Amino acid sequence: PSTLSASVGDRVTITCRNTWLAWYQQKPGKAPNLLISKASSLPSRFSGSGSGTEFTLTISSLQPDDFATYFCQQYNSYLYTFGQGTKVEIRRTVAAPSVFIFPPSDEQLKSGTASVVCLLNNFYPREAKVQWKVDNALQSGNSQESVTEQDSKDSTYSLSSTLTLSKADYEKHKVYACEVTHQGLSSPVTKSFNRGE
Amino acid sequence: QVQLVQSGAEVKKPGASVRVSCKASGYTFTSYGISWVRQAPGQGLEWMGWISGYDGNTNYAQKLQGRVTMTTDTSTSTAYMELRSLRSDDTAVYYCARDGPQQVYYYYGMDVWGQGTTVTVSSASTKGPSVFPLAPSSKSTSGGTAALGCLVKDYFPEPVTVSWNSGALTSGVHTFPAVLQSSGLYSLSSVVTVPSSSLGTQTYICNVNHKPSNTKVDKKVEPKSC
């Protein structure tokens, strides 16, 4: 799903990539809601009559409850297709992440595995980069990322990067570091520790 | 009061089959059609097929032809969907939607939707999570702010729920969406930021619930030195 950064009150025009049937809205964790159909139903701030060339959806002025993903429905020989969605996120001032690091607990080290957690808290925009170094060696393919949905109160995102090694591999090394780059940071942030310290 | 009510979450092994029901209410079932559409994790919507509440006649998508069957029960106002020869990529949320009064020029759209049915397809067996503390220390403290949390690891299937101090602690809490590992098990962390001055006197406990395995865990998270 494609992303558009907008402010409350902005006018938005979404183009559908005649075969057009309808426009839908979908909020996170919820089923889609019909907006407009060929029956020419929908007055409101949502309209499908932009122009007679391509099929578009116009939101005349975005309201606080309009931040969701929008997609069109089309047909091809009685076989429906759903165009790919446009996610509308709320735009706000740049906020740099607060960075925190958690070595593996001794409880996890009993069980033969070692996960190192790097937390990037309350940042904007969503685009942030995290890289792992183990004894000054750059890592790839042994970590996983997860990002929260945009916060309903402060409009920020939070991210976890989890490096997983076997206990045997974890004990063969000393320095563990995560390096963070983001729009709100003039220089990269490195959070690190020595194993056992 | 016009609504469609679907059956509960299902967990299936590859090669097996699944059956989902859709119960109509507050409208005449026989005068409308029913479409089935699925949504895979972090993906767009895929149309599966359509059935008439009047005729019982069907139109299936080419990809699913021979693998899917849709039926109707006009006496109980219920639509049914069966998906056979299940594979990992069939993991999705399945929706039924009211689709057209029973001349496609005046298309009414999919105007009423079911709550959705989650179907997980995997060779993994049910397993409760391993709950490890993410201790506040100097490495997770800057100024008067300390971060702490719980690592909820290696469980199957989704979902788990996490609360802090029996629901008394909600501000600053971030429970991350689960990631699926190469083992076929899920993993997530739940974190919270608190004043660093509170660490010596305030108790922090994460409450982890995993209904599929009947697991409940209350884990105390204690501060650590360096």
Numbering used by the authors:
A (entry chain B): 8 to 24, 30 to 54, 59 to 213
B (entry chain A): 1 to 102, 109 to 232
What do the paper's sentences say?
The Plasmodium falciparum reticulocyte-binding protein homolog 5 (PfRH5) is the leading target for next-generation vaccines against the disease-causing blood-stage of malaria. A fundamental and non-redundant event in this process is the binding of P. falciparum reticulocyte-binding protein homolog 5 (PfRH5) on the merozoite to its host RBC receptor basigin (BSG) (Crosnier et al., 2011). Here, we examine a panel of human monoclonal antibodies (mAbs) to PfRH5, isolated from the first clinical trial of a PfRH5-based vaccine (Payne et al., 2017), to define critical mAb epitopes in atomic detail. We identified a subset of mAbs with neutralizing activity that bind to three distinct sites and another subset of mAbs that are non-functional, or even antagonistic to neutralizing antibodies.
High-resolution structures of unbound R5.016 and R5.004 Fab fragment crystals were also determined, with clear electron density observed for all CDR loops in the bound states, facilitating determination of the complex structure. R5.016 binds predominantly to the N terminus of helix 2 of PfRH5. The major contact is mediated by the H3 loop, which lies along the groove between helices 2 and 3. In contrast, mAb R5.016 (from the more potent red bin) and BSG can simultaneously bind PfRH5 in solution and mAbs from the red epitope bin interfere little with binding to BSG, PfCyRPA, or PfP113. The most likely explanation for the efficacy of R5.016 is the proximity of its binding site on PfRH5 to the BSG binding site. With both PfRH5 and BSG constrained through attachment to their cognate membrane, R5.016 and other similar antibodies are likely to act by preventing PfRH5 from binding to BSG.
